[PDB]
Amino acid sequence: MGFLDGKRILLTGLLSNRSIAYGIAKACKREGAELAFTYVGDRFKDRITEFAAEFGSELVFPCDVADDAQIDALFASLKTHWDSLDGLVHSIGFAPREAIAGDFLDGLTRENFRIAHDISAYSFPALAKAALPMLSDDASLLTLSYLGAERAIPNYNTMGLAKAALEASVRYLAVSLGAKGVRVNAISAGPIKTLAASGIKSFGKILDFVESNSPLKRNVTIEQVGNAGAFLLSDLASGVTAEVMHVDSGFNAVVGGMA
Amino acid sequence: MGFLDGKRILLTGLLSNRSIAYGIAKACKREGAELAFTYVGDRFKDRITEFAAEFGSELVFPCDVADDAQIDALFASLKTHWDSLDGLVHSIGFAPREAIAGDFLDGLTRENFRIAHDISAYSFPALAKAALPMLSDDASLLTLSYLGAERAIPNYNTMGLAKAALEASVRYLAVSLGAKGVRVNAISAGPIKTLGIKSFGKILDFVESNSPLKRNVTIEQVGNAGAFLLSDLASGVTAEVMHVDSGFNAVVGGM
Amino acid sequence: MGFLDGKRILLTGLLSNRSIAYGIAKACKREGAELAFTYVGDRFKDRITEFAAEFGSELVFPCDVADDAQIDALFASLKTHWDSLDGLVHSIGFAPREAIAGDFLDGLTRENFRIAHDISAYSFPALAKAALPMLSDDASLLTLSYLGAERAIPNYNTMGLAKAALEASVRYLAVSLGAKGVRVNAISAGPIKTIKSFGKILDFVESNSPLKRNVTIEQVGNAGAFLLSDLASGVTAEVMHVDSGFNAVVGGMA
Amino acid sequence: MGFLDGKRILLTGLLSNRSIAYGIAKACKREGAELAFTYVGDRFKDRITEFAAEFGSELVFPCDVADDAQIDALFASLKTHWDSLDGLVHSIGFAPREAIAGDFLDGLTRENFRIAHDISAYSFPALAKAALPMLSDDASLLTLSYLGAERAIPNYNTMGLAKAALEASVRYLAVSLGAKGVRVNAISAGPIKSFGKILDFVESNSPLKRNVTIEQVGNAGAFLLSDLASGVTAEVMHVDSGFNAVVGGMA
């Protein structure tokens, strides 16, 4: 009797029990959804299979979003298991290391730009288009963004451009798919404290700053992002589309650091 | 177990079973919350008592937000029933008719401006301030706004100004109350179709034709989003103005 | 010659040679405009008359925007000298001190809220309405706002609400007056170096803005002159940031 | 003297007397600037040379921004005439036609997406980076965007994504170049078949009840390129008769 009972949801981007996708998966499973997962490379098949089993699922599929052949095969494969798809979680992003460090121009190249936008922005509407023939009429598609799309954040650089494109794709997708009934939204998530992420020194300084300056004086967790994601994927949110919802302890709404 | 199980929530602005506050009330009660209600004027005591009964509550209190004493007396009274308050729904707005019809300047007077901002904007942080001594550390405060705060919409006029101030108060309230743990948000709702004004019918038709989902929102949809924001499911969400409007805010419609 | 040649512009809010209105007045005069000024209260009549003379003007008028009668009498008096008005600069703002210091709720009262919104927001469309019978078809109306309307800034508090209402009034005014041809805009100015908390903000902006410097009244003045001029004839309903880019960044996290 | 007197400004995207770049060129020249121009394709060398002479200039350079080598050669060549560059006008945009007509998903392919973002977004910071060694400390860089970056506009489709990335590049460029003193801004211009329907709608529904002209965009651009705008950076300025600020069609 959870608020996602019977909904069939495909999640990308599950790499560990610290992934945002893992938090979303937990909340969706808690609320009654049936889950399926994608992975990148045969070397990760066994590990994603273990995660799927944790969520009562045997449905895992390769999908390197850099490759048309894998996008164009993903939903043909899923269709042999599920007549229709109710939810899609796009939790994927990448840019070369030099493009998200230091000076924006020093780290700028055409290939760095191309890759960042290809993986981090194009892949969301690309997956939506490949899924369309088996989407339920009231399906819900969800992607993940970050405040660096809206305002300049140190080091975020080329990923900020790609996330702005991603957030625009939410709006154009919502129009394209909305007459059928499909909703499309993003969560603009705050930084997440994990063991490895805190080791990244510049990222830890952001965490500390958000902790000191966000309205709630605390960083968000994957359970809080996961719950917001489960809401947007559900019929509870049937009035909500083309929205970029901040789940960031309110950080986006202030000018911090001046008190 | 509903996702508001045990939460004690005060709702203002419940006038009819087509109110947005009605949809929010229904969704909160569905998810296990205990409700209390305000009303304006002794003549409406019976009607609000009936509504509270529908939601299993006997807690109704007068509160004209134009009156400082009634705002203070509201929470003094509620405190004898509830040790702490977990939610507040602000569904209150008003401007004199001429200030929300026709040309913006034609309906502009100092008193029309004053009333619209007093009732529709000041009352939200005023209620929050009076409630603060009994708010739980996890409390959630919710108000209702409209796209006319962000862009100029025909006839909305002076209410567009007041709603912009209201949405700003959401951000300043979130800062003032957030260290304690209290969250503050607004829902920017689309128009709600009931049994009217030729100008309002034109807006409803236009939203149905031009919104991404090609349909107007219902009080059930706004209510479910409200229940979410009032709940621990939304513990990461504060200072947010969430559009519940079939996506209408995100397009340039009509072309 | 200058790009405001022959334009007749009324400026409010000139209190000193540090005022934003003084910087706007200097830029407008530099570009050929004819200027007139308002003042608040009989005690300031001599001081505004001295400032007006610096700009080659003898046109000064009382206008306490709290008073309906002074707003109405202002444009009757101005019409005696000027058949039409080409520009209006609204540089007026006030909130009781407690409402713009400390905690937002600590300083919140109904009367503090009322005054802040009456003086800082209502007065702009009020002046526009009273000016309309004599506005030229290509007049330009300009007000001043601040980033605290858009995001929560420490201590700005009730003024943030009033400036949000003001920026909304820019849009509704633009629609009301636009068919005639009148344009309506705001400048969201950065803080002007001229309080311990205010110094903290100035330091933060200088350290974290893209241009690594606070703005001057000269820079706000030139942007204002631009918006008041035919160079900006395609621009209305705009809130233009003149703030060294500060609004566009998340500072302090290095 | 004009408010751009002596400023040396390079303009891209001048294809005809209807180009936004032509309106900016005319205003900049009126205000005393010295101009240089780029062009694409040897077949257009004559046409751009005529435009340069109209504005009292002999300085024209080939630059297809799809090609790293042409971007690098552009500023190497320009440096043999100008020791420093005071202004740059990026007025370049392209997507394959099917990506900006009809339904958003019908025109969406990896290669259409790549081209639209390559030409319409990457090229602005690419040019900025190649120009940097010769940019004056107080130089001003200007790009052109459109409301489709902010809200979904019919048919604009993949170009809406690319313009959103472009407007973000304005903000990251302003941070990167700002300590030096360089300013970076965009003008979100109103529109200048399904396109004529949009012009009618904007004329009927914008606050000023009229479409913008390249003269109005050009004067706003000259302002942003000048020291009058020395307090302004990282800004996207709407020059669109107020259209961005309303919900039209409902009256």
Ligand SMILES: NC(=O)c1ccc[n+]([C@@H]2O[C@H](COP(=O)([O-])OP(=O)(O)OC[C@H]3O[C@@H](n4cnc5c(N)ncnc54)[C@H](O)[C@@H]3O)[C@@H](O)[C@H]2O)c1
């Ligand atoms: N981690 C945060 O603090 C944070 C904050 C805000 C937003 N986000 C966004 O949330 C999403 C998930 O991020 P995260 O927190 O899990 O960490 P992350 O950004 O390190 O994860 C990126 C994910 O993309 C996947 N990916 C990369 N290249 C791929 C390809 N070619 N094909 C398919 N998948 C590919 C990876 O497997 C990984 O799971 C991302 O879009 C990220 O930008 C993250």
Ligand SMILES: NC(=O)c1ccc[n+]([C@@H]2O[C@H](COP(=O)([O-])OP(=O)(O)OC[C@H]3O[C@@H](n4cnc5c(N)ncnc54)[C@H](O)[C@@H]3O)[C@@H](O)[C@H]2O)c1
């Ligand atoms: N109805 C819509 O289409 C719509 C759309 C977007 C936002 N909203 C907002 O949602 C809220 C509720 O809207 P609604 O649909 O229930 O109808 P509504 O617009 O009639 O709500 C106004 C409410 O304010 C209350 N109120 C008025 N003056 C009061 C006073 N002095 N003291 C106390 N309460 C007072 C009334 O009792 C009423 O319940 C309002 O804030 C409204 O602006 C409504």
Ligand SMILES: NC(=O)c1ccc[n+]([C@@H]2O[C@H](COP(=O)([O-])OP(=O)(O)OC[C@H]3O[C@@H](n4cnc5c(N)ncnc54)[C@H](O)[C@@H]3O)[C@@H](O)[C@H]2O)c1
């Ligand atoms: N000074 C800054 O750093 C800064 C930054 C951004 C925006 N702004 C805004 O720019 C405008 C000018 O501010 P400022 O920097 O010159 O200083 P200021 O904000 O202290 O000046 C306020 C002005 O309003 C006038 N005023 C106050 N009450 C009035 C009344 N009842 N009737 C008529 N006029 C009245 C005063 O005479 C004064 O000229 C204000 O709107 C202010 O909020 C200022």
Ligand SMILES: NC(=O)c1ccc[n+]([C@@H]2O[C@H](COP(=O)([O-])OP(=O)(O)OC[C@H]3O[C@@H](n4cnc5c(N)ncnc54)[C@H](O)[C@@H]3O)[C@@H](O)[C@H]2O)c1
């Ligand atoms: N035309 C409008 O209504 C409008 C409205 C808002 C914004 N804009 C933007 O303003 C700019 C100029 O638009 P416009 O009205 O002059 O027409 P336009 O959009 O047709 O011009 C695009 C320009 O890009 C140039 N270009 C294309 N590919 C190129 C390449 N590989 N290398 C170099 N240059 C290349 C073309 O020569 C052309 O001048 C564009 O960025 C456009 O998106 C236009």
